[PDB]
């Protein structure tokens, strides 16, 4: 299976990949959008995971054909790397279902939800490999001009992350033994900081902190809220406005 | 809604995972939508200013 | 303040009838003087007190009437009055349209939903709330229980029209109005600086020519 | 030695790698210790105290860092740029050792503020990237350009808040037993808080429905006043600040455009003068 097999694989990959991959992934997304549909799975639950497993078999066939294929260059496409991880986790969950026996909990456990969102990611990859034809050029240009200003928005979101982490740290430091049942840990503290950042019941935070004994925390919280809100949203808005604006100045 | 899916297993469960996935998706999508709205507005308004 | 109105009672009201800040301050003086004349010594028929801190805040506005930098900013942003009036009228027309639509959809049937899409003033206030982001969740829970499944679709269509159009058209209009207002001001300032630069260069050239001519004349006469 | 040693330890990459590794190790370790200080894990208790004393060792590292800073211009460094702010933050971060050695911190300790200050310095002395640096320069020059808009914002806040203190004066000063937003309009500082809430525009519908419990006096002046205040302030100031920051980006790019334009005409003139020099030879 030398370079001669690689060239034959390239030509027959073009032909057979086009025909077979397009038809089977169209049928795969048909059965998968019929799957989710949380009314029709009760009109089923015996013809759904059967076709799901059959087309997962087709997908590990795709992985096998890509493994015997050109190889290192296949790993140079990030979409193909995502497909490789998808197929690794798909063969993992398939053999996990196949072996049975086991000693851990099952029957719609959290691991089953992990495999379900994995199936969702597989559906997303099916959708992304049906759009090889006619994405339409207008939204192509719109998204290409959208993706032009990547370093600026990454820097702005990094600044947002640093400011949000600092505010969460100082708030959790100032919320010690201050009825912390809403924000007793790091996850709840960052989620509450997200709520203050997203205009979600921070007036409710003010009114149920007035019922407590601490009052200066309301000025601290509100000055932090206004500075981070104004600075971050204005920065992102202006950055994207100018990002499309120099493209506006062109043709 | 935050209290609706609250107390899944009262510390982390999927109460962490689904919430954080959906929250970062929500904030990214909301920023992208609001931006794209205002930028399309100013882009088509520059046609007026010409 | 009476003394200030005495200074502004001159013939200069021939300019305090067409100008900008000037009509604002004399009208502020009038709407200051009349109410506390009928409030501090009232002796009249009136309901209650709601314009003491308001009158003092008008006096604070008269304090802020100074600071010429704020005057220049006001001049730079005062050409957007017509634009914001036009967008306000558009908002009022859309609010009226969906006001009569909401009254005929949820208030006419009279099977609930009162004082939300019922009485006209409460209907208008609920529409102003729904055109913003606030209060949409509780209103949605209120409306879906009145046997109207399409009400949710109508409300989300109303939101995706009104909120986005109003907010984003406003921000774009003001962004580029301010940009085009400041562009010409900065260009005029740079033009004035350039004119001063060329005038100084011409003065230097004329001085050099005069010095050269004087030196040549002294060399000839010497 | 002295200043030469400071120059050498700043030149050597091993010292810089060590100090940045210590900085992010301290930032990662810092939040862990507040999670648990109980007997949930007895085997992890002495090693968690060892992590806390590694934080004390990082304070000793800050002590030897300011010892290295004495090897610099010494008295001249006492009044400088943000490096003097870093020095003050390191002093405030070495303060808690003193206030726990002699202060007996069973009081208003305020160690949390100094801790978040040294984290703030740690999150800013992280060898910031140039992409962060250019946007920080844009932000500081924009807030330099923010000379009169914040003054007008605070003065409109002042006049409208002090006007709206005694407008819904029948709300907080009402004897209705069932109410939950009465403290919003009660005090002047509470009035500032609630009109800032209205400026942020969160639950204005719920707020107005909670002020609808006031006897409805045909809503002729008060409701229209608060509605006009919230809408006018929010839309006008949001539009004006986004317009100012867009104009800041516009003039930044205009200065850039004129600068590479000038560079290009200078390069063309240099090419023409090079041809002239070649011909003259």
For this entry, give a set of tags.
part of a larger assembly; 4 chains; A: 251 residues; mainly alpha; 9 helices; 0% strand; extended; D: 281 residues; 73% helix
Total strands of chain B: the figure is 0
**Principal-axes shape call of chain C:** elongated
> Helical residue percent of chain B?
over 70%
Shape of chain B: rod-shaped
Tally of DSSP helical segments of chain C: 8
Content of β-strand of chain C: under 5%
Order of helices and strands of chain B: H
User: What can be said about the biggest beta sheet of chain B?
Assistant: none
Work out the helicity level of chain C. Answer: over 70%
Q: What structural category arises from helix and sheet content of chain B?
A: mainly alpha
Radius of gyration of chain B: 18 Å
Largest interface (C-beta under 8 Å):
A-D, 42 and 35 residues
List the helices and strands of chain C in order: HHHHHHHH
Number of strands of chain C: 0
Distance between the termini of chain B: 46 Å
Cα distance spanning the termini of chain C: 74 Å
| Rg over C-alpha atoms of chain C, rounded to the nearest angstrom | 31 Å
* Chain oligomer state: part of a larger assembly
Main beta sheet strand tally, sense and closure of chain C: none
Supply the number of helical segments of chain B. 1
PDB class: protein transport
Keywords: sperm, hyperactivation, calcium channel, protein transport
Entry title: The atomic coordinates of the mouse CatSper dimer
Chain A: Cation channel sperm-associated protein 1
Structure commentary:
With 251 residues, chain A is an all-alpha fold. Chain A is built from nine helices and no strands. Chain A has helices at 3-35, 48-67, 78-99, 110-130, 137-146, 150-174, 186-197, 202-210, 217-249. Chain A is extended, with a radius of gyration of 26 Å. Chain A starts with a helix and ends with a helix. Chain B has one helix at 13-49. Helix content of chain B is 74%, strand content 0%. Chain B is rod-shaped, with a radius of gyration of 18 Å. Chain C is built from eight helices and no strands. Chain C is elongated, with a radius of gyration of 31 Å. Chain D has 281 residues and is mainly α. Chain D has eleven helices and no strands. In chain D, helix 2 packs across helix 3 (45-70) and helix 7 (149-165) packs antiparallel against helix 11. The interface between B and C is small, with 9 and 10 residues. Chain C: This is Cation channel sperm-associated protein 3. Chain C: It catalyses: Ca(2+)(in) = Ca(2+)(out). Chain C: Keywords: Calcium, Calcium channel, Calcium transport, Cell membrane, Cell projection, Cilium, Developmental protein, Differentiation, Flagellum, Ion channel, Ion transport, Membrane, Spermatogenesis, Transmembrane, Transmembrane helix, Transport, Voltage-gated channel. Chain C: The chain crosses the membrane at residues 16-38, 51-67, 76-102, 150-175. Chain C: One of its GO terms (molecular function) is voltage-gated calcium channel activity. Chain B: This is Cation channel sperm-associated protein 4.
